[PDB]
Write an enzyme that holds these catalytic residues in place. Structure first.
Site, PDB file in Angstrom:
ATOM      1  N   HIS A  68       0.859  -1.222   0.000  1.00  0.00           N
ATOM      2  CA  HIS A  68       0.000   0.000   0.000  1.00  0.00           C
ATOM      3  C   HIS A  68       0.875   1.245   0.000  1.00  0.00           C
ATOM      4  CE1 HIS A  68      -3.332  -2.721   1.053  1.00  0.00           C
ATOM      5  NE2 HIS A  68      -4.010  -1.843   0.301  1.00  0.00           N
ATOM      6  N   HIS A  72       1.753   1.760  -5.586  1.00  0.00           N
ATOM      7  CA  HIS A  72       0.321   1.381  -5.666  1.00  0.00           C
ATOM      8  C   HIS A  72      -0.494   2.605  -6.098  1.00  0.00           C
ATOM      9  CE1 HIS A  72      -3.538  -0.421  -4.951  1.00  0.00           C
ATOM     10  NE2 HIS A  72      -3.829   0.541  -4.082  1.00  0.00           N
ATOM     11  N   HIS A 106      -5.671   7.796  -2.884  1.00  0.00           N
ATOM     12  CA  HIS A 106      -6.738   6.900  -2.395  1.00  0.00           C
ATOM     13  C   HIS A 106      -6.283   6.089  -1.168  1.00  0.00           C
ATOM     14  CE1 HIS A 106      -5.033   3.417  -4.484  1.00  0.00           C
ATOM     15  NE2 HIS A 106      -5.913   2.691  -3.803  1.00  0.00           N
ATOM     16  N   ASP A 107      -4.985   5.885  -0.967  1.00  0.00           N
ATOM     17  CA  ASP A 107      -4.446   5.067   0.151  1.00  0.00           C
ATOM     18  C   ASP A 107      -3.435   5.900   0.956  1.00  0.00           C
ATOM     19  OD1 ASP A 107      -5.812   2.531   0.267  1.00  0.00           O
ATOM     20  OD2 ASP A 107      -4.676   1.853  -1.485  1.00  0.00           O
ATOM     21  N   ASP A 217      -8.278  -0.237  -8.376  1.00  0.00           N
ATOM     22  CA  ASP A 217      -7.616  -0.635  -7.113  1.00  0.00           C
ATOM     23  C   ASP A 217      -7.166  -2.093  -7.179  1.00  0.00           C
ATOM     24  OD1 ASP A 217      -6.589  -0.303  -4.573  1.00  0.00           O
ATOM     25  OD2 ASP A 217      -8.560  -0.153  -3.620  1.00  0.00           O
TER      26      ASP A 217
HETATM   27  C1  LIG Z   1      -4.901  -9.876  -5.628  1.00  0.00           C
HETATM   28  N1  LIG Z   1      -5.459  -8.838  -4.746  1.00  0.00           N
HETATM   29  N2  LIG Z   1      -5.462  -7.454  -5.045  1.00  0.00           N
HETATM   30  C2  LIG Z   1      -6.014  -6.806  -4.043  1.00  0.00           C
HETATM   31  C3  LIG Z   1      -6.422  -7.738  -3.050  1.00  0.00           C
HETATM   32  C4  LIG Z   1      -7.111  -7.301  -1.793  1.00  0.00           C
HETATM   33  O1  LIG Z   1      -8.014  -7.944  -1.277  1.00  0.00           O
HETATM   34  N3  LIG Z   1      -6.771  -6.141  -1.180  1.00  0.00           N
HETATM   35  C5  LIG Z   1      -5.763  -5.097  -1.441  1.00  0.00           C
HETATM   36  C6  LIG Z   1      -6.016  -4.594   0.005  1.00  0.00           C
HETATM   37  C7  LIG Z   1      -7.274  -5.477   0.059  1.00  0.00           C
HETATM   38  C8  LIG Z   1      -6.037  -9.052  -3.495  1.00  0.00           C
HETATM   39  C9  LIG Z   1      -6.241 -10.426  -2.870  1.00  0.00           C
HETATM   40  O2  LIG Z   1      -5.565 -11.385  -3.200  1.00  0.00           O
HETATM   41  N4  LIG Z   1      -7.217 -10.673  -1.962  1.00  0.00           N
HETATM   42  C10 LIG Z   1      -7.553 -11.925  -1.389  1.00  0.00           C
HETATM   43  C11 LIG Z   1      -6.674 -12.966  -1.063  1.00  0.00           C
HETATM   44  C12 LIG Z   1      -7.196 -14.152  -0.503  1.00  0.00           C
HETATM   45  C13 LIG Z   1      -8.559 -14.353  -0.264  1.00  0.00           C
HETATM   46  C14 LIG Z   1      -9.452 -13.311  -0.589  1.00  0.00           C
HETATM   47  C15 LIG Z   1     -10.943 -13.370  -0.413  1.00  0.00           C
HETATM   48  O3  LIG Z   1     -11.533 -12.452   0.140  1.00  0.00           O
HETATM   49  N5  LIG Z   1     -11.663 -14.411  -0.921  1.00  0.00           N
HETATM   50  C16 LIG Z   1     -13.068 -14.499  -0.816  1.00  0.00           C
HETATM   51  C17 LIG Z   1     -13.851 -13.341  -0.651  1.00  0.00           C
HETATM   52  C18 LIG Z   1     -15.239 -13.443  -0.549  1.00  0.00           C
HETATM   53  C19 LIG Z   1     -15.853 -14.696  -0.622  1.00  0.00           C
HETATM   54  C20 LIG Z   1     -15.076 -15.848  -0.799  1.00  0.00           C
HETATM   55  C21 LIG Z   1     -13.690 -15.756  -0.902  1.00  0.00           C
HETATM   56  C22 LIG Z   1      -8.920 -12.130  -1.150  1.00  0.00           C
HETATM   57 MG   LIG Z   2      -7.367   1.357   0.494  1.00  0.00          MG
HETATM   58 ZN   LIG Z   3      -5.548   0.838  -2.913  1.00  0.00          ZN
END
Ligand SMILES: Cn1ncc(C(=O)N2CCC2)c1C(=O)Nc1cccc(C(=O)Nc2ccccc2)c1
Ligand SMILES: [Mg+2]
Ligand SMILES: [Zn+2]
Length: 313
Positions: A68, A72, A106-107, A217
């Site tokens: 972040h 980013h 934004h961050d 984002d």
């Molecule tokens: C690649 N990428 N880019 C941005 C972000 C991100 O979340 N953020 C950047 C600050 C927050 C991510 C990312 O990998 N997230 C991530 C990783 C593992 C599990 C889940 C998840 O929530 N699954 C899930 C949701 C609802 C229902 C079922 C399963 C999410």
């Molecule tokens: Mg943010």
């Molecule tokens: Zn962001």
């Protein structure tokens, strides 16, 4: 007035594509942004001297966290740049000014922790802002920097145009709260299917700008596999840090954040592309047809993660 920024040929061409990486040279990021504002807005919409001083104060107020961070900020501004340039006539003069600034800011002052960790920590910001904690702070830091002497990049706007642009920026930064994304996409899906979407309804434009902000984002998932793969390492470096800090508060963290559950990451990414990313670029494609390359690149990376699981990498 007659001072156009110009990039090397490879960047001049690849900067117009959705999947562009801004590269590892920190000191080129400010010129890249200014280049984008000039082509996206006009050479005329900001005083160069004021813009530059704003950009360098924004940079200063991002921290040395794995993900972040300042890179980013500029990556997200570039994605917004590509959407605006591929959708030339849909956006007002004020939206083009507001939205690149919104992405950059934004961050602002992110410490690398979720709103959840702030609430369970009982951070002072959790008391001041009960929902969208970090996002209300981000906006707060944007308004602070705009009110530094020689930093008011909107000085040539009227009192009422100035209030419209800070309102575009506030809603845009609040929309980067992923908790708000799900309901916002659900409602935009319904408005598009039942034929009721209308871009002259101000409340409809807000929702659509919100979805662009989510799409910009999450844009690490719309890059070539090698950029997507290596960015994911930074994302999870933050997630494991917060997991460690949850454990310090005597709380077993969710698996996503546990560094002992490194094995489950590829499965976790499948969930995330299926639950969040694909739905997001799908609906965005339906509303703004020319953003289809984001959907395509997102799908390619989903398939790269399926190949990770099948032991094929
Ligand atoms: C690649 N990428 N880019 C941005 C972000 C991100 O979340 N953020 C950047 C600050 C927050 C991510 C990312 O990998 N997230 C991530 C990783 C593992 C599990 C889940 C998840 O929530 N699954 C899930 C949701 C609802 C229902 C079922 C399963 C999410
Ligand atoms: Mg943010
Ligand atoms: Zn962001």
């Amino acid at each position: 007035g007659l001072m156009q920024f110009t990039l090397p040929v490879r960047l001049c061409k690849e900067i117009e594509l959705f999947h562009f990486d801004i590269g590892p040279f920190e000191n080129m990021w400010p010129g890249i942004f200014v280049y984008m504002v000039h082509r996206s807005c006009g050479t005329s919409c900001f005083e160069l001297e004021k813009l530059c001083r704003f950009i360098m104060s924004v940079k200063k107020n991002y921290r040395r966290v794995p993900y972040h961070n300042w890179k980013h900020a500029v990556t997200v501004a570039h994605c917004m740049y590509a959407i605006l340039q591929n959708n030339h006539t849909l956006f007002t003069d004020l939206e083009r000014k507001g939205l690149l600034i919104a992405c950059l800011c934004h961050d602002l002052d992110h410490r690398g922790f979720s709103n959840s960790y702030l609430q369970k920590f009982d951070h002072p910001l959790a008391a001041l802002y009960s929902t969208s904690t970090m996002e209300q702070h981000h906006f707060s830091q944007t308004v602070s920097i705009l009110q530094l002497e020689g930093h008011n990049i909107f000085s040539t706007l009227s009192s009422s145009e100035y209030e419209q642009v800070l309102e575009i920026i506030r809603k845009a930064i609040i929309a980067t709260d992923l908790a708000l994304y799900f309901g916002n996409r659900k409602q935009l899906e319904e408005m598009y299917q039942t034929g009721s979407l209308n871009l002259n309804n101000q409340s409809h434009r807000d929702r659509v700008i919100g979805l662009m902000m989510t799409a910009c984002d999450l844009c690490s998932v719309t890059k070539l596999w090698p950029v997507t793969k290596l960015t994911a390492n930074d994302i999870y470096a933050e997630f494991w840090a917060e997991g460690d800090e949850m454990k310090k508060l005597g709380i077993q963290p969710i698996p996503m954040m546990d560094r002992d559950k490194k094995d489950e990451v590829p499965q976790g990414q499948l969930g995330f592309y299926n639950a969040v990313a694909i739905p997001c670029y799908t609906t965005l494609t339906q509303i703004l047809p020319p953003t289809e390359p984001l959907l395509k690149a997102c799908r390619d990376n989903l398939s790269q993660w399926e190949k990770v699981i099948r032991g094929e990498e």
